[PDB]
Symmetry: C2
Subunit: 793 residues, 2 copies
């Protein structure tokens, strides 16, 4: 039968899982202090060589920690699930939050007094030497004013590192760090030295070699710690394990992997070491079933049980990573989340189906571990085997939010439209939440900014004003609109003004990272940085993009359609009354009964998400106006801006920046998540809603769209629930939606977790493009997830 | 007749002159301290804006000093003829020399204890933050090793600023600093903001505007000081002068000049303020008679005596500038020397003669003032009026070394061969010593390096060795040469190896200046920096070059010819004995009589400078081998390397780096100056010697060649003396030599200045492309000048 069920993990895997779940996150100082001293010691070097010295000091001197029971080793932090500090990007919020970070609503971290004193001393070096301080200096005053008023924000790469990449894991698996060094050495040998261009390329090459020499030492330090622990082990079974780990770390990643266990250790060293070099999140394993499976197939000795246990251990290690952000930024990325997206299935470079036995082991590992990370995903195409889709649906029924599902038949042509070859696009993986790329060939900047389209709508209707600040052009007061043509013309002018500022802000951050923090370790693992002699930050990648995200799409669409229908077509109210009602927040505080009646009229207009073409096409048009502006622009790496539509955990946060809207929502209330219909407003069932969402132009939003659905668990029960559920996915993907993902949970389970969080520490659910512990989320985010529409078949 | 003699200066001018002569040069700290605080305060800015903040703080806060009697005001230093410190380029040698600089051989400066304490504190900021520290980091180990062994040096721009430019004085005279600000404002309004490129251009533009706003303030601060002094001044005439100076400085250079006195004040504000922004020397007024004359002709009130006295005051102000360098570099640029070349005459853009009345006033000013500066020059072409050449010749007869003479008919086609338009080339001026450019269109880097061709010959004959060290390729041992073909093959291979390293070193310094010290004040006065939105350091100039200088040309030619004639042709000695004699320094210590007999044989070979084709063509070929290798290379500004041949005061210094040579020269002895025949070896008179020098390829050495002659004064006496002397210049220029200049002095006058320097403080003579106080020069440089061939007709 279609319902196969899931096996159980070993007792050791349960212990390792529980270590993550019980861990109290700390802030730690050692990496920050070492980095700072490497900067201090190397003021005279070009930035790329200084950055080599940084990772060399950290890799040589960071504490090496092997946790009880691990088979796969490597720790960013001494304490499980803790965070380093990367002061080179930003630091002052850390010190501002020394005493409040342990108690803040979103993602609290403990900062012990000694750690605070150590960070205080190191931060003395940093004023004005960060990437953020340089980025802000490049931006115009109007751009900064627009961000201060909540039109958009580039905080992600402003305050932290970039990340958002899937590196060439397979290359390191094959030839190791030593192979990387040899490739660079041959690039040096072949350098054209007839002009002045070789001088900086040679600095890059020597920086990469130094970085990778230190990276080899780092693995050897873990081998040494494993041997030290082995000598004082008393259980001979664990002793032999530690001896085997020492052997593994001696071989990899210096050399290519020769067993499946070594291949797992190669993967984890890369995955953790990249996040030691930089705090950029969305370091995404990508197509792990593809590049790892050859090492499983070739390992004739390994048992199926132990092979699965190693994948489980990788899943758990993926949850050891954590990241603190400033108190407001943490609310937009909430849940101790670093967005490591790992996908399985899809197509080979040849257009054949890519499923292999490891594909299903990856699904089993998710069922075994049941933790937020990795951000597990499946690719789907016309040739997806029934067995893979139904097994994925079985996994989704567990209610963890994973796997998210991505549609090859939209994503591949979407990438092609941006210049990615068919061969490279067929190999895509997901970065972060929903953002597709050709892996190890792209510097995509896939979460460069958040952009509030609903705020632009607000500002349009107030003639460029926000507060009493003239923030955009005076496109005309809404009372002077003769019809919807006047609105759209005004809305497009506002969009052009604010998107140009968005692009300025992203590109200023882009220049700042290129000038102050080019990365020699990361860059060697992406084509064509070695061949070109250029870092990722300076255009070494074959493909270059920048991806800013739209917020408030359904809010904007339903509001614009409410103006069309209720004011112009049916004349239920005038432009003057609408203006008055919006400014008065529909009488929320005054009690004005005409404004209340107006609100009730607008609230009951047709809404996006009910398969009604009239209103669905307005949502499509409003999203297009954003997406068509964004793609007009380029970044300093020679690449193209491309829109995405996804909220991570900030559709509540950024709703606070928007006053009352013509669809009737009150000031400061939440916005809609991604391309999903407004919370509770898709009332005709999951098929009708998905039909609406697929009417949007997903292809032009080539940084990725995000669609959330939430199902009543009993609707998915039994073989016949699975079949209906799989039919819904194929329906939506056949109609050219890009992505869909599912919560499967009873309302009372969420309500109980709120009332009794101590009893629900392992409740993991989808936020948007990632899953998190529900009890870690702030109440306002929890309420937003509860408020989402419950679907039923 | 042809000798009309010279008028005398006013008593004021004599007082202003003697103030320079009697000044004891100090090191001062104010500018270094202010610059350091501006860097400390502005760590977060892009470099161009940081440099704007640097000049803003200095221009706002540097002490304002007006000296007794001046009509033209503006002081770089509080004390006359003193030096500021520019730690942004290098600092550590200043502190190493706190206790020794007042007593050192070449260019001593007094450093009082208060000043050393101030600089000690300021220097704490600088480790690793200088342009020099970055430049070194880009250079390969072999390049730095060749420099340590004396093959070549890039010290000039490594330790100090660049300079070496003639800015658009005419533009500032016409539109003022306000007009510069207006052009940049229009460039801002016209910026294409559709890509990412505008972000950095707009930073440059904002940096230029800020710098020029502060530049206006600087002039107003001098106006306020003149007004303050006027209220204090008992003498009614001097009171009115100070009131007029206050009016001048209020008008210029914020606005264009409206009198000749204001034009002189504009000139001097530009000249001094450029050398406040940067320590780069060879800030060259260039075609002063061309851009200043319209303001003289339009000034219908000024008397000729006052106009002359203002020009005299300009000449004296040019001697107020001074510059300290580390104690070894000071020996290469000896004489309190900043190389401000000012030329008169030549052609206009349409190819007409450019002589005007101010042309002759500039010659008079040199006769009035008789100080080392400016480095006064004349252009000469086929159409030079006889009155011009003969007047310049009378001036040379005064023995100051000036004017140097430059041949349009070589320089203009030479510049054309480097891509300069005929129009631009016709407007050329001289930079520094002998280096031509199209003024306000060029970033020429005209003294980027000193390169020791004689050392390359030494190394060639020792199979790539220098001392106990393999510095170049193993091109073969001397004893294995079958003939001169073998030697030239090896020599060219050595030359290619070391010139590649030279180019690396230059380009490393070039990159470092572009990344850390782009200049927003200077850059605005050179085409096309404003139009392109790019500093000079990043390629804003229309024409870009790099100019490295050959040393030991005559030494190399005569040695190579001595091998050809004495070894291969006449078989007076074997290659084996020559190797032994060179290694043993011709028996200078051993007394070996065969090596002494070989020395005598080689010393009496024919020598370059006696109009003997056989040996002259070897000098030509050897100089060509250098010049042809240099021109194969480019710089990171998109420009071309081009050789020059000139020694400034370093042919003695760099001869110390060369062991015995095949021409009989003993180890460590001086090398020949520029393209001049070896000291004392041209024995057939000045026409024969000039004929030899003109056989070299001067056109390919388009960074400039330098030829010194020295005459017995009685030989130039009378109308007949002048006629011979003009005919010699016209002979040499018709035969396509690029430059010539003359000492005219009795040997006993130099000898008496050595024995009784306190009676010869005003004795000014030519070193090489510049003039200096003979008593300020080290004994070994004095002796070298005394050893030069004395000519007579």
């Amino acid at each position: 039968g279609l319902e196969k069920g899931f096996t159980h993990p070993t007792d050791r895997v349960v212990r390792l899982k529980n270590m993550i779940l019980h861990a109290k996150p700390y802030v730690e100082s050692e990496r920050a202090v070492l980095a700072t001293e490497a900067y201090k010691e190397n003021e005279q070097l070009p930035a790329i060589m200084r950055r080599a010295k940084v990772v060399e000091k950290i890799f040589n001197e960071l504490p090496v920690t092997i946790r009880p029971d691990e088979l796969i080793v490597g720790a960013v932090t001494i304490n499980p699930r803790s965070t380093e500090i990367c002061p080179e990007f930003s630091y002052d919020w850390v010190e501002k939050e020394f005493d409040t970070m342990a108690h803040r609503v979103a993602d609290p971290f403990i900062i012990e007094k000694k750690t605070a004193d150590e960070l205080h001393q190191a931060f003395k070096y940093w004023p004005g030497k960060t990437t953020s301080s340089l980025a802000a200096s490049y931006m115009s005053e109007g751009t900064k004013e627009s961000m201060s008023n909540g039109v958009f924000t580039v905080g992600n790469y402003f305050f932290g590192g970039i990340g958002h990449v899937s590196v060439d894991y397979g290359k390191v698996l094959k030839i190791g760090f030593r192979g990387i060094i040899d490739e660079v050495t041959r690039a040096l040998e072949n350098l054209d030295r007839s002009t002045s261009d070789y001088i900086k390329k040679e600095q890059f090459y020597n920086a990469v070699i130094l970085s990778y020499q230190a990276a080899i030492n780092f693995a050897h330090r873990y081998a040494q710690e494993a041997s030290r622990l082995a000598r004082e082990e008393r259980d001979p079974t664990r002793q032999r394990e530690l001896e085997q780990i020492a052997s593994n770390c001696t071989r990899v990643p210096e050399y290519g992997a020769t067993t499946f266990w070594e291949a797992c250790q190669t993967f984890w060293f890369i995955q953790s070491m990249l996040q030691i070099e930089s705090s950029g999140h969305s370091i995404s394993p990508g197509r792990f079933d593809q590049y790892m499976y050859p090492y499983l197939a070739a390992d004739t000795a390994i048992s199926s049980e132990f092979a699965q246990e190693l994948v489980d251990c990788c899943w758990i290690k993926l949850n050891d990573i954590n990241k603190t952000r400033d108190e407001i930024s943490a609310q937009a990325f909430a849940g101790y989340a670093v967005f490591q997206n790992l996908c399985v299935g899809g197509q080979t470079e040849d257009g054949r189906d890519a499923t292999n036995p490891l594909t299903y082991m990856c699904m089993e590992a998710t069922a075994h571990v049941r933790l937020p990370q990795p951000s597990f995903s499946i690719r789907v195409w016309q040739g997806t085997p029934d067995e893979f889709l139904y097994r994925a649906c079985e996994l989704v029924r567990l209610g963890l939010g994973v796997p998210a599902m991505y549609n090859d038949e939209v994503i591949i042509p979407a990438l092609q439209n941006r210049g990615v070859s068919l061969h490279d696009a067929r190999d895509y993986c997901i970065i972060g939440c929903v953002e597709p790329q050709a892996p190890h060939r792209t510097e995509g900047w896939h979460d460069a900014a958040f952009f509030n389209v609903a705020k632009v709508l607000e500002i349009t209707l107030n003639n460029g004003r926000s507060g009493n600040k003239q923030l955009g052009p005076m496109t005309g007061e809404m009372t002077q609109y003769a019809g919807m043509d006047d609105f759209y013309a005004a809305f497009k002018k506002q969009m052009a003004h604010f998107v140009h500022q968005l692009v300025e802000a992203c590109n200023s951050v882009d220049i700042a990272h290129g000038e102050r923090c080019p990365l020699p370790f990361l860059s060697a693992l992406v084509d064509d940085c070695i061949g070109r002699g250029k870092s990722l930050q300076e255009g070494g990648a074959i493909y270059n993009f920048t991806g800013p995200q739209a917020f408030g799409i359904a809010d904007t669409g339903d509001s614009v359609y409410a103006i069309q229908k209720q004011v112009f077509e049916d004349r239920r109210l005038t432009l003057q009354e609408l203006k008055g009602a919006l400014d008065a927040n529909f009488g929320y505080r005054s009690g004005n009964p005409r404004y209340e009646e107006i609100r009730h009229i607008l609230e009951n207009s047709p809404c996006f998400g009910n398969d009604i073409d009239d209103v669905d096409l307005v949502a499509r048009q409003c999203a297009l106006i954003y997406c068509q502006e964004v793609e007009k622009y380029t970044n300093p790496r020679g690449g193209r801006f491309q829109a995405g539509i996804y909220p991570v955990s900030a559709n509540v946060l950024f709703g606070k920046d928007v006053s009352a809207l013509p669809d009737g929502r009150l000031a400061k209330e939440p916005l809609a998540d991604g391309v999903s219909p407004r919370q509770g407003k898709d009332t005709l069932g999951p098929t009708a809603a998905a039909n609406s969402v697929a009417k949007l132009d997903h292809f032009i939003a080539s940084n990725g769209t995000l669609y959330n659905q939430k199902f009543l668990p009993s609707s998915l029960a039994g073989e016949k629930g699975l079949r209906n559920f799989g039919g819904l996915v194929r329906n939506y993907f056949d109609k050219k939606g890009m992505h869909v993902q599912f919560n499967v949970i009873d309302r009372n389970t969420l309500l109980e977790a709120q009332k009794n969080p101590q009893q629900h520490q392992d409740l993991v659910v989808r936020v948007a493009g990632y899953s998190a512990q529900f009890v870690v989320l702030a109440k306002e985010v929890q309420d937003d997830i509860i408020s989402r529409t419950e679907q039923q078949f």
